[PDB]
Design a protein around this ligand. Structure first.
Ligand SMILES: C=C(C)CCOP(=O)(O)OP(=O)(O)O
Ligand SMILES: C=C(C)CCOP(=O)(O)OP(=O)(O)O
Lengths: 248, 260
């Protein structure tokens, strides 16, 4: 029924190249998603799909201009300008991704967190709109953004936040983390799986820490795999496993 | 005190010219909003400000393509393309407006209804984020947009839906309607005041055959002000300084008072 596919801010834009886009990779990814959705239409199987991407070479480079170290602590200043400028950057990125998805007849739509998400001690994030969108078989595309934080003023909600939240808030059947590594790497090897068992000895060794952690905190079950290898995204969507499983 | 300024009529954009932008007007408007903010600082008086704009030559033109009359009613079709297409056009318009506002150091930020608003018989419209933005003295810029409803459909939410809703939710003290005309025209002349001693008398005239506005636009604005027990002005947003004055509470168009 409901799958959430995160596109790791990396396979979409080169983070060391401010304002860059990996066009061919992006166009391939859109195609695989399209082929996947098409596959389901054939099996006459109804699938609901949400998409998340990061700030890639857009969010971060601009955010940077408004983060200064106040004694080992990231601080946002000049947000009278910074809030918009970070919104704008993320909008450019969001537009580019949605347009490309659209060119493949993928019914993508923009979800812009900065407008309504408050990263308060208790995350505030009304999903009413998204649930409706899913009833119409639209594909909400959500992105890491700048958001208000009723405690610290501003925060940079990331995909790793949105994904688990929504998976749980919406009861997602499948969770996908597309990225530039074949899965969670230990000693440079993608562990086949991650449970309640070998978990303990992994948090220690330490998808990164942040993820794994608040994706067990929601008792989720997602796959971390490589979005750069042609066909991986397609397969991932059909309920295959090509990377690291994280069950909770 | 919380003010909501609606940039309406066609003061920002000529809807008969695809993707029209009245640059000069928009730039002057930003100035005036600036003059006003700088003023309220010098007089050490706290002002929270929200701006709202419509679709102009961006919304309706694009939306038209996805609207049909079926069995007498309106209905949205092909929204697998349509929803983004309308979002896209409204995002562009918002960008241009906010960029210009920022170019005058107005701390404007974007509020995109399409992403989170559900058009029911009551709006589902979480204003939490807006509250925190005002708290930090940002200027939230909300715009008419496409939105899903709770009945298998879609609906255009206008400034007309947004303003009233926010005035209630945030308890605004001042509503400002910048329009294409000098106020509520009663005999090609704007009525100075409209209060609980002439409202019905005015509403009834507005329904008449001598009224210059048959659109039922004024009637609606008047009613929302009373409904919120606050104050509002309907003025010509095309006249130099009207927006600055209005923001100070002294513009000369039509006052509507049901505060207290
Ligand atoms: C920075 C913004 C606005 C987007 C969030 O970042 P990503 O989710 O893409 O990556 P992280 O920096 O959070 O790891
Ligand atoms: C996307 C669209 C069409 C927004 C229009 O909102 P308005 O505030 O202009 O509402 P109307 O004038 O169209 O009634």
């Amino acid at each position: 029924m409901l799958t959430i596919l995160k596109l790791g801010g990396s396979i979409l834009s080169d983070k060391n190249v401010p304002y860059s886009i990996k066009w061919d990779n992006l166009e391939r990814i859109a195609m695989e998603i399209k082929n996947a959705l098409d596959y389901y239409k054939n099996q006459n199987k109804e699938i609901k799909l949400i998409l998340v991407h990061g700030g890639g070479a857009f969010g971060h480079p601009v955010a940077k201009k408004y983060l200064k170290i106040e004694d080992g602590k990231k601080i946002f200043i000049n947000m009278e300008k910074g809030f918009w400028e970070i919104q704008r950057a993320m909008r450019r990125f969001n537009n580019i991704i949605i347009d490309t998805l659209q060119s493949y007849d993928i019914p993508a739509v923009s979800i812009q967190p900065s407008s309504f998400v408050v990263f308060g001690d208790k995350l505030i994030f009304d999903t009413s709109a998204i649930k409706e969108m899913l009833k119409r078989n639209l594909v909400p595309v959500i992105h890491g953004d700048i958001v208000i934080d009723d405690k610290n003023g501003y925060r940079i909600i990331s995909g790793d936040d949105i994904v688990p939240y929504l998976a749980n808030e919406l009861k997602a059947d499948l969770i996908l983390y597309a990225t530039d590594v074949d899965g969670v790497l230990i000693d440079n090897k993608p562990i086949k799986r991650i449970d309640k068992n070998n978990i303990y000895k992994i948090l220690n060794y330490l998808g990164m820490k942040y993820k794994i952690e608040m994706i067990r905190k929601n008792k989720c079950r997602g796959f971390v795999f490589n979005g750069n290898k042609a066909n991986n995204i397609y397969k991932a969507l059909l309920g295959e496993v090509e990377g690291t499983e994280i069950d909770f």
